[PDB]
Amino acid sequence: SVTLRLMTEHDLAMLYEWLNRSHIVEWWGARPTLADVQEQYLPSVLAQESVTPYIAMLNGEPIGYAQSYVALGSGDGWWEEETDPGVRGIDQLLANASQLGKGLGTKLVRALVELLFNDPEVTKIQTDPSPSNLRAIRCYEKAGFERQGTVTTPDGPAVYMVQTRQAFERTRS
Numbered sequence: 001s002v003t004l005r006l007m008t009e010h011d012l013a014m015l016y017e018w019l020n021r022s023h024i025v026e027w028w029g030a031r032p033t034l035a036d037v038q039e040q041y042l043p044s045v046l047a048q049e050s051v052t053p054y055i056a057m058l059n060g061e062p063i064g065y066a067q068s069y070v071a072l073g074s075g076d077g078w079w080e081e082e083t084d085p086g087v088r089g090i091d092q093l094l095a096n097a098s099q100l101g102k103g104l105g106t107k108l109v110r111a112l113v114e115l116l117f118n119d120p121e122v123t124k125i126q127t128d129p130s131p132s133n134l135r136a137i138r139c140y141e142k143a144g145f146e147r148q149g150t151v152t153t154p155d156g157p158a159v160y161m162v163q164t165r166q167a168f169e170r171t172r173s
């Protein structure tokens, strides 16, 4: 089973290594220096953009990184049409290339979705994989997200996917 813990400052050097692995570099929104990671992913810095970092754990070992964010609190250009403060967005990665395509990502996303719905004010979860990122799209579908359509983001077009609280209630059983 995959669990999630808050990321700390002590995880930054580890995250730096992960973010420079080829399987991560090709998708993650490119090759950050250690200083880049320390300056941008420090939990208190991410907090300023309403972003919460997590480390995914499996059998006592860190296996991935995830982020949740309040869409309404995102930076300029991001989710500019949003009006609901209950909307959360997610992003995630698996650290080890050998562990890709084995269902661990789906387990990670499911764990993150459950955590977020334990915030009573949360109404809906969104994700924004790029159209080219078909593996991520299928992962989110397996985790209970539904493709809505194409949206323009500051990083380019994305396949906008959502999972509502009601949908989670009906499938969690």
Ligand SMILES: CC(C)(COP(=O)(O)OP(=O)(O)OC[C@H]1O[C@@H](n2cnc3c(N)ncnc32)[C@H](O)[C@@H]1OP(=O)(O)O)[C@@H](O)C(=O)NCCC(=O)NCCS
Residues within 6 Å of the ligand: 023, 024, 027, 028, 091, 092, 093, 094, 095, 099, 100, 101, 102, 103, 104, 105, 106, 107, 128, 129, 130, 133, 134, 135, 136, 138, 139, 142
């Ligand atoms: C996205 C990510 C977290 C998904 O985790 P994962 O464990 O690899 O995904 P899962 O094994 O749970 O599911 C992958 C699904 O995608 C499918 N798939 C893989 N490549 C595909 C492709 N090119 N086209 C269509 N489907 C594809 C697999 O068949 C599998 O579905 P299945 O169970 O029906 O066979 C992981 O691949 C990852 O960290 N990728 C690199 C970073 C990244 O892309 N981050 C997300 C950015 S939005």
